[PDB]
Structure 1
Amino acid sequence: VPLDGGRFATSDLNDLYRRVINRNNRLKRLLDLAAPDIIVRNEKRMLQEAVDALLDNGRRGRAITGSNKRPLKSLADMIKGKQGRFRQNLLGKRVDYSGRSVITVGPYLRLHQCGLPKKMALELFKPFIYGKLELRGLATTIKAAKKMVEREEAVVWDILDEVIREHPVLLNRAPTLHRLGIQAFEPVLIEGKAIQLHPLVCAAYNADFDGDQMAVHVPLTLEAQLEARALMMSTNNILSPANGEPIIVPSQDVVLGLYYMTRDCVNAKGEGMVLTGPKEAERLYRSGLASLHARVKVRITEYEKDANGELVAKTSLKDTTVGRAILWMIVPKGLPYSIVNQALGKKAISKMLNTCYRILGLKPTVIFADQIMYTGFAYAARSGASVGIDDMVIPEKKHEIISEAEAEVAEIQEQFQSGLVTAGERYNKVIDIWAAANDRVSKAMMDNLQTETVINRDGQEEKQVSFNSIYMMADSGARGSAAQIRQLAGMRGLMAKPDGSIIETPITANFREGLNVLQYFISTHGARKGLADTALKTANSGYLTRRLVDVA
């Protein structure tokens, strides 16, 4: 191929063919001249070498090289090696009618639709717009339609909205580990340049909103459109194919909202009140006359399919909080009332969705998930739950425990210095002492953090579960666990070594306090190892999955 400036670009096969032809012609010339046998034998060896390098370069004496010092690519090298036709172009190839962009949240969406930029939609659906413009007479020819879309006339946007009406688009994220990495959504034209992704599907994609990008493809044929609508739609794939559990469970902020709403405290506004139903509960809460955590009695009516699908109703006076009664207004008919009569952490919500799916069906569950998401977001916002430094309450008896551990380890060390215990025994003894100290510190921290005193209906002390923001996040399943809180407010703990051993002396400082420069080096020791192990695990898992799909 010619390039600009008289320069050319060529394949390596031209050089190999030229060499073969040159040596063949020289051999014919030598046979013509009746040369001595030595010369013709050498020429024949050279011809053999040239042909074998043409067919396959590497597997012989070294390998011929070009003008630069890289080996020439032979015919065989063009078929194999992960850069050949079999694996580089015949199974994975670039496609038209595709785009990519960053992703944002768009919490207002419904489970079956996604927000698509208007300019991306205009570029992707261009032939459809030309067809619509010509069909309705707004353009005489396809050239006129092209000019109209290029100038972005007013009618072009109406035509685009008509074209996009019911036409799914496949969204995909690069590490496609399972079949839920590609899903079909209905486009919703938006401004800007970022795709909006429904929160509930994020876990399916394993996607967050800190810089991730997604690719969008558009089906063309009627069969492709119907497959996207009936097979790949996001409202069809709500159960995991690995196990029958749901995979659209609310993740972190919905869980916090629903946990805060469904939760009781000892003494709140309007305790002991008797309500006529959920609507009166919501009216009282919004009027400011009652608290969202107020133990009242509410007249609840619940339906049951205790027949051949009849939904018989039962009305009673339940004992619940205002928040639970308010939340009951989104639950469908057939479900009982005991599902929403608890704290509703992370697992309770998943169990509730699973029960809804198994008792009622698919469409009610799809509506229920959206209602759950909206309510959780709304009430998490309304709670105003934040995080401060004073929320990380360190035990008041941590220093005493550390002093006790130090005294015991000093005793063990001086005992060893007197030749009563061997090195291994004393090392194990010190490890055990520090482990016990860490366990005691963690127990004290958690016991101090998981309860609070509130008074009262009459004026007496009464314990209750704490409303600490850190504890609420950890306990509801929204985010965090015991280890994170231990590191924040307990002691960072016991570290390891590059050898894999355990350092006898632990990091006795948490992150609310600071780690001195010597304690912060042992942490860097382990962070690097963590990152390297993550990379290695990704590579190994990919290789295993490829070998596993090859066989089956």
Structure 2
Amino acid sequence: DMIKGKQGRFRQNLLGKRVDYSGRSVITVGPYLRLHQCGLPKKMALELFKPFIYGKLELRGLATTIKAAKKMVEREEAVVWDILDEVIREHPVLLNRAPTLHRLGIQAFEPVLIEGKAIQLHPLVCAAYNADFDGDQMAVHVPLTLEAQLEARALMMSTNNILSPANGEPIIVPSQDVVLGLYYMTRDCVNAKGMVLTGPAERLYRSGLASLHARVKVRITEYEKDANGELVAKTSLKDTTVGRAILWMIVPKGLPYSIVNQALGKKAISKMLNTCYRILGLKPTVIFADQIMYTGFAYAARSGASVGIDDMVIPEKKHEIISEAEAEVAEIQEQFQSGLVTAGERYNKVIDIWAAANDRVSKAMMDNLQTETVINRDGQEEKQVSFNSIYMMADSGARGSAAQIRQLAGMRGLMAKP
């Protein structure tokens, strides 16, 4: 029992083992951490860095002895913090989201001091870890050899391992609600506080009449780097928005504006970073991934996207559909009893009709959810592509699907038994 089964030395004390200079705590979202960074409470930094303190006071005179220093180190006194910038200012902390079935469950960063008792976690790597904020945890490991710190920056750093090992889309990527912000900045509307309109200046959201859905148009000269390093210059009329135009601040301008002339849900946004990785270079692709994060947070809230009792519209013409499907079943359950089906085919010959009822209602549902503004124009009838949030939660790819929408706008349908 020191060897044969699970508890043996091989698995409990060798290929995995208990480890010093380490810890764990509950994950928390850290939207002001830059991509190379992680947040750590002052007294956790003190605990994890004791060998730098009970190891440098005796090397500057900043305490009379390591014995007396008990009064000063546990106190978090001023002299601790030169001793810790001498680490922090260029030191790669390692972080961990066990069970590490895949590489990206462990990465390397850089300390930022904070309050509290948590571990603060940069939003683009929260996707790469699959971080699940129900009071589950992550773990921390300090590298202390010069070699481990050299290889952590070179080999384990978030900025330096961005992509899926199975293919090469980013998984260190614009994450859960960040991409609704980017989708919102890149959606457009009828009337729109600007059905066609333009401006620069965020302060003009305080001039009286603007929207990130207002429909800008502009000639933008635009460029595309060749494999040799030269720039294939181009120019085009555009049909765009204020948020699509602001993204020309953030976009690495050696790839052309016309790539932004769409709606940047999770369905699409990864492929901009992927195209940057295929063509420009590493630093340009990191900056383009990182700076999109705060760009999402400046505008994701201002979308006002929700779930609520009239974000849940329903097709009226469900009434007519119930005059088909439940009526088809009504004679078919007689045909069994009058001698024209057995009990068995009759199960399929009614479940298939319940499936056809769900799929009939699912057609009417999409007209009402996406277009049914009917009243008869002129002067009426803005039959535009809808701004229902439950639909937008699926077309942004934020978290929605057709299987959610059926249950929320027409019919929950059918289930399995055990």
Measured against the shorter chain, the TM-score band is over 0.9
How far apart, in 2, do the equivalents of 1:289 and 1:456 lie?
28
How far apart, in 1, do the equivalents of 2:297 and 2:103 lie?
28
Contact 1:285 1:322 (8 Å CA) reproduced: no
Q: CA separation of 1:352/1:128 partners in 2, compared to 1, >3 Å: closer, same or farther?
A: same
How far apart, in 2, do the equivalents of 1:240 and 1:496 lie?
34
The C-alpha deviation readout for 1:382-418, integer Å capped at 9, x for no partner, is: 2222221111112212244234322221201111111
Q: CA separation of 1:287/1:306 partners in 2, compared to 1, >3 Å: closer, same or farther?
A: farther
Following TM superposition, by how much is the alpha carbon of 1:181 offset from its aligned partner in structure 2, in angstroms?
1.0
Contact 2:52 2:83 (8 Å CA) reproduced: no
Contact 1:334 1:359 (8 Å CA) reproduced: no
Q: CA separation of 1:455/1:131 partners in 2, compared to 1, >3 Å: closer, same or farther?
A: farther
Is 1:439 the counterpart of 2:359? The answer is: yes
Following TM superposition, by how much is the alpha carbon of 1:306 offset from its aligned partner in structure 2, in angstroms?
4.5
How far apart, in 1, do the equivalents of 2:405 and 2:362 lie?
9
Following TM superposition, by how much is the alpha carbon of 1:307 offset from its aligned partner in structure 2, in angstroms?
7.4
Following TM superposition, by how much is the alpha carbon of 1:454 offset from its aligned partner in structure 2, in angstroms?
9.4
Following TM superposition, by how much is the alpha carbon of 1:199 offset from its aligned partner in structure 2, in angstroms?
1.1
How far apart, in 2, do the equivalents of 1:457 and 1:412 lie?
44
The C-alpha deviation readout for 1:83-126, integer Å capped at 9, x for no partner, is: 22232212211011111111100111111100011111101110
Q: CA separation of 1:495/1:307 partners in 2, compared to 1, >3 Å: closer, same or farther?
A: closer
Is 1:372 the counterpart of 2:292? The answer is: yes
Deviates more, 1:314-323 or 1:234-243: 314-323
Contact 1:267 1:455 (8 Å CA) reproduced: no
The C-alpha deviation readout for 1:485-504, integer Å capped at 9, x for no partner, is: 1112222111222xxxxxxx
Match of 1:276 in 2: 198
Following TM superposition, by how much is the alpha carbon of 1:221 offset from its aligned partner in structure 2, in angstroms?
0.7
Q: CA separation of 1:143/1:170 partners in 2, compared to 1, >3 Å: closer, same or farther?
A: same
Taking only the aligned residue pairs, the percentage that are identical comes to: 100
Alignment of 1:247-326 (within 5 A): 247-269=171-193, 284-285=204-205, 287-306=207-226, 308-311=228-231, 313-326=233-246
Contact 2:198 2:216 (8 Å CA) reproduced: no
Contact 1:332 1:368 (8 Å CA) reproduced: yes
- Residues paired across the two proteins, number: 417
Following TM superposition, by how much is the alpha carbon of 1:156 offset from its aligned partner in structure 2, in angstroms?
1.9
How far apart, in 1, do the equivalents of 2:84 and 2:7 lie?
40
The C-alpha deviation readout for 1:314-348, integer Å capped at 9, x for no partner, is: 45543322221122221012111221101222121
Secondary structure (helix, strand or coil) at the match of 2:222 reads: strand
Contact 1:298 1:317 (8 Å CA) reproduced: yes
The C-alpha deviation readout for 1:46-87, integer Å capped at 9, x for no partner, is: xxxxxxxxxxxxxxxxxxxxxxxxxxxxxxx33322222232
The C-alpha deviation readout for 1:442-486, integer Å capped at 9, x for no partner, is: 111122101254999984644221001111112110111010111
Contact 1:105 1:198 (8 Å CA) reproduced: yes
The C-alpha deviation readout for 1:343-362, integer Å capped at 9, x for no partner, is: 22212101111111111111
How far apart, in 2, do the equivalents of 1:338 and 1:283 lie?
26
Match of 1:494 in 2: 414
Correspondence for 1:143 among 63, 67, 70: 67
Q: CA separation of 1:151/1:267 partners in 2, compared to 1, >3 Å: closer, same or farther?
A: closer
TM-score by length of 1: 0.71
Secondary structure (helix, strand or coil) at the match of 2:236 reads: strand
Q: CA separation of 1:340/1:452 partners in 2, compared to 1, >3 Å: closer, same or farther?
A: farther
Q: Taking CA–CA contacts closer than 8 Å with sequence separation of 6 or more, which of the two structures ends up with the larger relative contact order? A: 2
Following TM superposition, by how much is the alpha carbon of 1:236 offset from its aligned partner in structure 2, in angstroms?
0.7
Correspondence for 1:192 among 91, 94, 116: 116
Contact 2:196 2:215 (8 Å CA) reproduced: no
How far apart, in 1, do the equivalents of 2:29 and 2:265 lie?
23
Match of 1:129 in 2: 53
Secondary structure (helix, strand or coil) at the match of 1:99 reads: strand
Match of 1:351 in 2: 271
Q: CA separation of 1:172/1:118 partners in 2, compared to 1, >3 Å: closer, same or farther?
A: same
How far apart, in 2, do the equivalents of 1:252 and 1:209 lie?
12
Following TM superposition, by how much is the alpha carbon of 1:273 offset from its aligned partner in structure 2, in angstroms?
9.5
How far apart, in 1, do the equivalents of 2:202 and 2:378 lie?
27
Contact 1:166 1:186 (8 Å CA) reproduced: yes
Secondary structure (helix, strand or coil) at the match of 1:445 reads: helix
Following TM superposition, by how much is the alpha carbon of 1:225 offset from its aligned partner in structure 2, in angstroms?
0.9
Secondary structure (helix, strand or coil) at the match of 2:238 reads: strand
Deviates more, 1:300-309 or 1:228-237: 300-309
Deviates more, 1:456-465 or 1:87-96: 456-465
Deviates more, 1:308-317 or 1:192-201: 308-317
Match of 1:7 in 2: none
Q: CA separation of 1:292/1:286 partners in 2, compared to 1, >3 Å: closer, same or farther?
A: farther
How far apart, in 2, do the equivalents of 1:86 and 1:102 lie?
30
How far apart, in 2, do the equivalents of 1:318 and 1:448 lie?
31
How far apart, in 2, do the equivalents of 1:254 and 1:84 lie?
45
Secondary structure (helix, strand or coil) at the match of 2:124 reads: helix
Following TM superposition, by how much is the alpha carbon of 1:223 offset from its aligned partner in structure 2, in angstroms?
0.9
Secondary structure (helix, strand or coil) at the match of 2:233 reads: strand
Contact 2:38 2:111 (8 Å CA) reproduced: yes
Q: CA separation of 1:125/1:267 partners in 2, compared to 1, >3 Å: closer, same or farther?
A: same
Contact 2:197 2:214 (8 Å CA) reproduced: no
Q: CA separation of 1:92/1:273 partners in 2, compared to 1, >3 Å: closer, same or farther?
A: closer
Q: CA separation of 1:462/1:247 partners in 2, compared to 1, >3 Å: closer, same or farther?
A: same
Contact 1:303 1:333 (8 Å CA) reproduced: yes
Structure 1: runs of 5 or more not aligned: 1-76, 498-552
How far apart, in 1, do the equivalents of 2:188 and 2:79 lie?
56
Following TM superposition, by how much is the alpha carbon of 1:184 offset from its aligned partner in structure 2, in angstroms?
0.8
Contact 2:185 2:241 (8 Å CA) reproduced: no
TM-score by length of 2: 0.92
Q: CA separation of 1:150/1:389 partners in 2, compared to 1, >3 Å: closer, same or farther?
A: same
Deviates more, 1:126-135 or 1:361-370: 126-135
Following TM superposition, by how much is the alpha carbon of 1:192 offset from its aligned partner in structure 2, in angstroms?
0.8
Q: CA separation of 1:275/1:482 partners in 2, compared to 1, >3 Å: closer, same or farther?
A: closer
Following TM superposition, by how much is the alpha carbon of 1:308 offset from its aligned partner in structure 2, in angstroms?
3.1
Q: CA separation of 1:289/1:203 partners in 2, compared to 1, >3 Å: closer, same or farther?
A: same
Contact 2:198 2:215 (8 Å CA) reproduced: no
Contact 1:117 1:194 (8 Å CA) reproduced: yes
Structure 2: runs of 5 or more not aligned: none
Secondary structure (helix, strand or coil) at the match of 2:140 reads: strand
